[PDB]
Design a protein around this nucleic acid. Structure first.
Ligand code: NVP
Ligand code: MG
Lengths: 403, 545
RNA sequence: UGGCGCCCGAACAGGGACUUGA
C-alpha cells in the first residue's frame, strides 16, 4: 500500500523551468529514461500536468555511466512538513565522532516501492530537446524518486528491517541515511572497516538494494608573525582584529592602535612596545580558542559561506547567525590543474555539505562567490552527489575574505 | 474520422465554470454566427445542450465573418497547462536540408476532440438563445495549444519512428518537414505523411498549394541551405522619437544575430530618462554616425549557414569599444552560423576582462540552448593577462576553451594595484564627509610631509566624497602613492580594476590610476584613531559634524 | 484578449557598505 503524501498547506506543485542541457546530457538522459519507462519506474504524461522539475545528468565518482539526478529542492521545500515532522530520520550525534565514514549509495532501493498516485503528478520532469526542435519528453515518477527528501522518509520503514540484522550483529556501527546515500561510520581500521562495509553491501544485495570525521578540525584565525612590523602590516592587523571583534567579543585593538597615533608612512618599521606585545599575545590567545556562546539550533537552517583565497585555496564557514561560525575550515585543492575555478568550487560545495550532513544532518544554504550564469552552466558537469544543497550568489566583501 | 485520445482537463480547485450572459449582437452578426454554427454543427464538432447546462461564454463575430469566442473567464479558471515549446529553434541550430515543406494543417485546434467531461464548460449561446458547446479544442482557449501540440506529437510518433531521416517541426500548426532526400522521393514521403495525418482526421493542403521556400518563419527567411532574417528597413527621418527609436533598436537587435558589427549602445543610451513617446530627442553626434554605419551594414544581404554536427564550433569574440562585444559563431571561415552582440555593462563598474567573461557566459548559455555544446572560443585577451586576472580575482571565473586571436582591439588590464607598499612613495590618507541634509560635502588628504588640502563639494553624496578624496590623492601627487581610504565602497570601486564606469568621477579616478606607475590602495577601519585618518576626519569634517 | 523578447519607471522584499540623531 502506497504511503499517502501531501504537500504543505497553501502550496502548489513545483512549476520550475528546465535549465538547458548539453547534447551529451540530453542523449544520456533519453537513453536511461527510456529504460526506466520500460521498467515501469517512470511513465509518460500529457500536457495536463503543469508541474515540472529540473533534471541533470552526471557521472558518478570513479564511474563512467551517467546517473540522472532531479533538482527536487523545490519539492523538498513543498513537502517540508511531511519529511521533517510526519516522517523523519533521527540524526545520530555519534556519527561525526567516528574514525571512518563511508557514503554508500542506497538510492536504487527506493524504486522497489510505489509512489502515491495523488502525488505522482508533482514529481513530473521534462527532458529538454536540443534547440527545442522537438517538444521535450515529459515523464512522471511511478516510484519513490531519487533526490526527493520524502523518499528516504517513506523507505525508512523497510530500511530499518533491512539493516536490523547488521545493526544487531555489529552494534558498534552507526548508520544514517540523509537523502539517498547511507553514511556508515565505525571506529575500525580502514581495511577492516571496508571489510565490514562489504558485509553490509552483501546484506543489501541480498534484500535487493570515504570520510575521516576524526580528521576534521576547525581552522582558527592566526595572526601574522614577523620581526619587522611595518605601518601597513599593523594597519592590516588592526583592521583584521577589529573585524574579528564581532566574532570574538574579547578582541581589543586599543593598544595596537596606540602605536599609530601620528601620521606615518606605510613603509615605516615601528617597533612594538611591551604593552602592545602583551596586547598582541592576548589577541593571539583569544583567536586560538572556540567562539563562546555559539550552539547549533535545529530550528534554524544552516548557512554556508565560501571565499576564494586564491592559488586553489578556499575557506568556508558554516553558521546560523552572522559572526557565529559553527565550523570554519579550509578546502585545500584536490583537482583542477590550476586552471578550473568552478570545478574546485563544486568540489568544495560537495565536501562542505557532506561534512554538514555528517555533523548536523542538513545541507547549509550556500553563498557562492561566483556569477549566477557561470555556476548555473558549469556546476552540473562536476557534480557527483545524489543530493543538491540550497545556494545563493553574493559578492564577497574584501574584509571578511581575509582568513 | 479523428481517433485522437482526449487529454483530461480539470477545473481549478474551489472554482466553478464560467457563467457570463452573452451581450446581444447586431442582426447581421447574429445571422452570420448562426450560419457558421449551423455548418460547424454539421461538421460534428458542435452540439446542442439546451438549458440543462448552466455554464455560458459570450461570443461575437469580427469581420466573411470570423467567429471569435472570448474564453477570458475560462482561460483564468482552467488548470495551468505546460506549454513545453516556450521557445523557438534558432535557425543556426538547424541542419542543411535538401528539401522542406510547410504542410499547413487546416483546422488545427478544430480536429482534436475535447475532454468529454469538459465540453459542458465551453458552452456558449447565440441570440435568437441557441446554446452550443465545443466538442473540440476552441481557438483562444488556454489549453488548446498545449493539448493540440501533444496530440500532434503522438500522431507523428508512429510516422517519425518509421522515418528517422525525416525531421518534422511543428510550431503552432505548420509542419516543417525536412527530409534531406531527393525531391522525387521527398514528395512521395510528404504524400505518405499527408495521408498518415488524414488517417487521424487532420487535413493538409495539396502539393500544388504547398508554400515554396524560403519560408517566412518568426522573422527569419529560411532557405533549405541558408537562413536569414526578414528584410529590416530602418526609417530614414530626422525627427526621431522614443517610440521610433524603440523600433530602430528592436530591428537592429533582430539584425544583430546575423549582420555583424551592429551597435545599439548609443541609441539605447538615448532612451535613458525618457518616458513620453512624443519627446523629440534629436540624434546625438555620437549616435548619428553609429546609425549610418549600421545602415551600411544592413545595405547588403548577409546569409548565414546551418549547423554541421561533424565540424568544430567556433565563436570569435571581438571588441569595438565602449563596452561593446561582437561574436561570430562559425564552423568554417567566413561562414558564420550566427553573429551577435553583448552590449550590457552588468553593474556600474566593470573592465574589459570581466565584460569579456560575461560575454562568454552569454555565448555558452545560448550555444547550449541552440547547439548543446560550448564553442571553441577565439578571444582577443592574452593568455597571461587572463591568468593574471582570474588568479587575482575574488570570483570563480573560468573560460572553458579558447585560443588567442591577435585582433587590433586587444583586451588588457589598463592598471594593476600594487600588492605591497611602495618604498619611497608618499602616503595619502584620504576621506570625505557629506552633510546629511544640505548635501554639501568635503574631500581632503594628509601626507607625511604635512601637505593639507580640502576642496568644498556641493550636491555630492558621502560615497562621492570618498571617491573625490581618492581622486585628489591621484591628482596632487607623484607617480608612486600609497592611498589609505577607510571606505569599503571605494575599495570595491578600485580593487575591481574597472576599465570604464558609468559615473564620470570614477572614470577620472581610473584615468589618473592608469598614469600612475605604482599605486597602492590600503584600508583602515573608520573611527579608530589609526594614523592620519583621524587627522583627515578633523579636516574634512569641520562644518559637517 | 493573452503570451513572449528588450528598455524605462514605481512599489516591493531581504543582503552589503556608509552618514547623522537618540
Ligand atoms: C522553421 C523551422 C524550424 C525548425 N526546423 C526547420 C524549420 N524550417 C525550415 O525551413 C528548415 C530549413 C532548413 C533545415 N531545416 C528546417 N527545418 C527542419 C524541419 C526540417
Ligand atoms: Mg570618515
Amino acid at each position: 500500500e502506497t504511503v499517502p503524501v501531501k504537500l504543505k498547506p497553501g502550496m502548489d506543485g513545483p512549476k520550475v523551468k528546465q535549465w538547458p542541457l548539453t547534447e551529451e546530457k540530453i542523449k544520456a538522459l533519453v537513453e536511461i529514461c527510456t529504460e526506466m519507462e520500460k521498467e515501469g519506474k517512470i511513465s509518460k504524461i500529457g500536457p495536463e500536468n503543469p508541474y515540472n522539475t529540473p533534471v541533470f545528468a552526471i557521472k558518478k565518482k570513479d564511474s563512467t555511466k551517467w546517473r540522472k539526478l532531479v533538482d527536487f529542492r523545490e519539492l523538498n521545500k513543498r513537502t517540508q512538513d511531511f519529511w521533517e515532522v510526519q516522517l523523519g530520520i533521527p540524526h545520530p550525534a555519534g556519527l561525526k565522532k567516528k574514525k571512518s565514514v563511508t557514503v554508500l549509495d542506497v538510492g536504487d532501493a527506493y524504486f522497489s516501492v510505489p509512489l502515491d498516485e495523488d502525488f505522482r503528478k508533482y514529481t513530473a520532469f521534462t527532458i529538454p530537446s536540443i534547440n527545442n526542435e522537438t517538444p521535450g519528453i515529459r515523464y512522471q515518477y511511478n516510484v519513490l524518486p531519487q533526490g526527493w527528501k520524502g523518499s528516504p522518509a517513506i523507505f525508512q520503514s523497510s530500511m530499518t528491517k533491512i539493516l536490523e540484522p547488521f545493526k544487531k550483529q555489529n552494534p558498534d556501527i552507526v548508520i544514517y541515511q540523509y537523502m539517498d546515500d547511507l553514511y556508515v561510520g565505525s571506529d575500525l581500521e580502514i581495511g577492516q572497516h571496508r571489510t565490514k562495509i562489504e558485509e553490509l553491501r552483501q546484506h543489501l544485495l541480498r534484500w535487493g538494494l570515504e570520510l575521516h570525521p576524526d580528521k576534521w578540525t576547525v581552522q582558527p584565525i592566526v595572526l601574522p608573525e614577523k620581526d619587522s612590523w611595518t605601518v601597513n602590516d599593523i594597519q592590516k592587523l588592526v583592521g583584521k582584529l577589529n573585524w574579528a571583534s564581532q566574532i570574538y567579543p574579547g578582541i581589543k585593538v586599543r593598544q595596537l592602535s596606540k602605536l599609530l597615533r601620528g601620521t606615518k608612512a606605510l613603509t615605516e618599521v615601528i617597533p612594538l612596545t611591551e604593552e602592545a606585545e602583551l596586547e598582541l599575545a592576548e589577541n593571539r590567545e583569544i583567536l586560538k580558542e572556540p567562539v563562546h556562546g555559539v550552539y547549533y539550533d535545529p530550528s534554524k537552517d544552516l548557512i554556508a559561506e565560501i571565499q576564494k583565497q586564491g592559488q586553489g585555496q578556499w575557506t568556508y564557514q558554516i553558521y546560523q547567525e552572522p559572526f557565529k561560525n559553527l565550523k570554519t575550515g579550509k578546502y585545500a585543492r584536490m583537482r583542477g590543474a590550476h586552471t578550473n575555478d568552478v570545478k574546485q568550487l563544486t568540489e568544495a560545495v560537495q565536501k562542505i555539505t557532506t561534512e554538514s550532513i555528517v555533523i548536523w544532518g542538513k545541507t547549509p544554504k550556500f553563498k557562492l562567490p561566483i556569477q549566477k550564469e557561470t555556476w548555473e552552466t558549469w556546476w552540473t558537469e562536476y557534480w557527483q552527489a545524489t543530493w543538491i544543497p540550497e545556494w545563493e550568489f553574493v559578492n564577497t566583501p574584501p574584509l571578511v575574505k581575509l582568513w | 474520422i479523428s481517433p485522437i485520445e482526449t487529454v483530461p482537463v480539470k477545473l481549478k480547485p474551489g472554482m466553478d465554470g464560467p457563467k457570463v450572459k452573452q451581450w446581444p449582437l447586431t442582426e447581421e452578426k447574429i445571422k452570420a454566427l448562426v450560419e457558421i454554427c449551423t455548418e460547424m454543427e454539421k461538421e460534428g464538432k458542435i452540439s446542442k445542450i439546451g438549458p440543462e447546462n448552466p455554464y455560458n461564454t459570450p461570443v461575437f463575430a469580427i469581420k466573411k465573418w470570423r467567429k471569435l469566442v472570448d474564453f477570458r473567464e475560462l482561460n483564468k479558471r482552467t488548470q495551468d497547462f505546460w506549454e513545453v515549446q516556450l521557445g523557438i529553434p534558432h535557425p543556426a541550430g538547424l541542419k542543411k536540408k535538401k528539401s522542406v515543406t510547410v504542410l499547413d494543417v487546416g483546422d488545427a485546434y478544430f480536429s482534436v476532440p475535447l475532454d468529454e467531461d469538459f465540453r459542458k464548460y465551453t458552452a456558449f449561446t447565440i441570440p435568437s438563445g441557441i446554446r452550443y458547446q465545443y466538442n473540440v479544442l476552441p481557438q483562444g482557449w488556454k489549453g488548446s495549444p498545449a493539448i493540440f501540440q501533444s496530440s500532434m506529437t503522438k500522431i507523428l510518433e508512429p510516422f517519425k519512428k518509421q522515418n528517422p531521416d525525416i525531421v518534422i517541426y511543428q510550431y503552432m500548426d505548420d509542419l516543417y518537414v525536412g527530409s534531406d532526400l531527393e525531391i522525387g522521393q521527398h514528395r512521395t514521403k510528404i504524400e505518405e505523411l499527408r495521408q498518415h495525418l488524414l488517417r487521424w482526421g487532420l487535413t493538409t493542403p495539396d502539393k500544388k498549394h504547398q508554400k515554396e521556400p524560403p519560408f517566412l518563419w518568426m522573422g527569419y527567411e529560411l532557405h533549405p541551405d541558408k537562413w536569414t532574417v526578414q528584410p529590416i528597413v530602418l526609417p530614414e527621418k530626422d525627427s526621431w522619437t522614443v517610440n521610433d527609436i524603440c523600433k530602430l533598436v528592436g530591428k537592429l537587435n533582430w539584425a544583430s544575430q546575423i549582420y555583424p558589427g551592429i551597435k545599439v549602445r548609443q541609441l539605447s543610451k538615448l532612451l535613458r530618462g525618457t518616458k513620453a513617446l512624443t519627446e523629440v530627442i534629436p540624434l546625438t553626434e555620437e549616435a548619428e554616425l553609429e546609425l549610418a554605419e549600421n545602415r551600411e551594414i544592413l545595405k547588403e544581404p548577409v546569409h548565414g549557414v546551418y549547423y554541421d554536427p561533424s565540424k568544430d564550433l567556433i565563436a570569435e569574440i571581438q571588441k569595438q569599444g565602449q563596452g561593446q562585444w561582437t561574436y561570430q559563431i562559425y564552423q568554417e571561415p567566413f561562414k558564420n552560423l550566427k553573429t551577435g552582440k553583448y552590449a550590457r555593462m552588468r553593474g556600474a563598474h566593470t573592465n574589459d576582462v570581466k565584460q569579456l567573461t560575461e560575454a562568454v557566459q552569454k555565448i555558452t548559455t545560448e550555444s547550449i540552448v541552440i547547439w548543446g555544446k560550448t564553442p571553441k572560443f577565439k578571444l582577443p585577451i592574452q593568455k597571461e593577462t587572463w591568468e593574471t586576472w582570474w588568479t587575482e580575482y575574488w570570483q570563480a571565473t573560468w573560460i572553458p576553451e579558447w585560443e588567442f586571436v591577435n585582433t587590433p582591439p586587444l583586451v588588457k588590464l589598463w592598471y594593476q594595484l600594487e600588492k605591497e607598499p611602495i618604498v619611497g612613495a608618499e602616503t595619502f590618507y584620504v576621506d570625505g564627509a557629506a552633510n546629511r541634509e544640505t548635501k554639501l560635502g568635503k574631500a581632503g588628504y594628509v601626507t607625511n610631509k604635512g601637505r593639507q588640502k580640502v576642496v568644498p563639494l556641493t550636491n555630492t553624496t558621502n560615497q562621492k566624497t570618498q571617491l573625490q578624496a581618492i581622486y585628489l590623492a591621484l591628482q596632487d601627487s607623484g607617480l608612486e602613492v600609497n592611498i589609505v581610504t577607510d571606505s569599503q565602497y571605494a575599495l570595491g570601486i578600485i580593487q575591481a580594476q574597472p576599465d570604464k564606469s558609468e559615473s564620470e568621477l570614477v572614470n577620472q579616478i581610473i584615468e589618473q590610476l592608469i598614469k600612475k606607475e605604482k599605486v597602492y590602495l590600503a584600508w583602515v577601519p573608520a573611527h579608530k584613531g589609526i594614523g592620519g585618518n583621524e587627522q583627515v576626519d578633523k579636516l574634512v569634517s569641520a562644518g559637517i559634524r
